[PDB]
Every structure is written in structure tokens, then in C-alpha cells.
RNA sequence: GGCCAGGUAGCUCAGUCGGUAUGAGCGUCCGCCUGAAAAGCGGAAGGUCGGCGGUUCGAUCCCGCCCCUGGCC
């Protein structure tokens, strides 16, 4: 199982950093697809059904 | 007032009684291509699955109410 407490924490850190680095709304839609969509690493944590 | 059967992407519609709707056709975007296009090929974006709540670590899928449609009255 690849869902250690140090795995989800680092994945969110890369997500919140890219979300905070989103300067315009068009970049936020790109970051949302890479960190909150159905293909994001956090989605893979939920893809592991 | 009765059990039901339906509301799902921009349009028209499939599909699951619990963790991915690997949704389809068309519509939108990018690349190859063209003077510029389209088709073709190769990549993608986009749904909070009818609303408000209830159970659950987790609900499009189960309880309740209602919003709106047919059905049969």
C-alpha cells in the first residue's frame, strides 16, 4: 500500500504550492486538473479503490 | 393521494444498489497537416450524476422530504 502518512502529506504540499503559485485564473484551472482532477496524484490515492 | 419508472458533459443519450461515469456520438481546445481551413491521425479540457438533509473513514448508487416529467388513474 502506497498511502503512508509521508506520501499524502508531500503530495498535498506540491498541490498547495502550485495552487499558491497560480497567478491567474487560467493557471488555476490547469493546476486544478493536475492536483484535483481525476488524473491527479491525489486522485490516484482515491483510484486505489 | 398510490407504488413505480425517469432528471447524468455544450447537444442527444447510455451506464453503475458505495471509493475510476477508464461514458458514447456530436460540440470545445492543442499538435502533425494547409497560404489559411476541414477531414484523417495523435493528444487533451470540461459533470460537483435533480435540490436540501440523514447513515458511513468514503454516496451518482441506501433512508426521508421536496422541486419537475411521463406512465397508468
Curated annotation (Swiss-Prot):
Instruction: Write out the annotated subcellular location.
Output: Cytoplasm
Q: Which cysteines are joined by disulfide bonds?
A: none
Query: What residue ranges carry the coiled-coil annotation?
Result: none
Q: Which domain of life is it from?
A: Bacteria
Q: Which residues form the signal peptide?
A: none
Describe its assembly.
Tetramer of two alpha and two beta subunits.
Family per UniProt?
Answer: Belongs to the class-II aminoacyl-tRNA synthetase family. Phe-tRNA synthetase alpha subunit type 1 subfamily.
- Identification of the protein by name: Phenylalanine--tRNA ligase alpha subunit
Q: Which organism is it from?
A: Mycobacterium tuberculosis (strain ATCC 25618 / H37Rv)
The root-end lineage is: Bacteria, Bacillati, Actinomycetota, Actinomycetes, Mycobacteriales
Gene (name only): pheS
First-to-last residue of the parent protein present:
1 to 48 of 341
Amino acid at each position: 500500500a502506497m498511502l503512508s502518512p509521508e506520501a499524502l502529506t508531500t503530495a498535498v504540499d506540491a498541490a498547495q504550492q502550485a495552487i499558491a503559485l497560480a497567478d491567474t485564473l487560467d493557471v488555476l484551472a490547469r493546476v486544478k486538473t493536475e492536483h484535483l482532477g481525476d488524473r491527479s496524484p491525489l486522485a490516484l490515492a482515491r483510484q486505489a479503490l
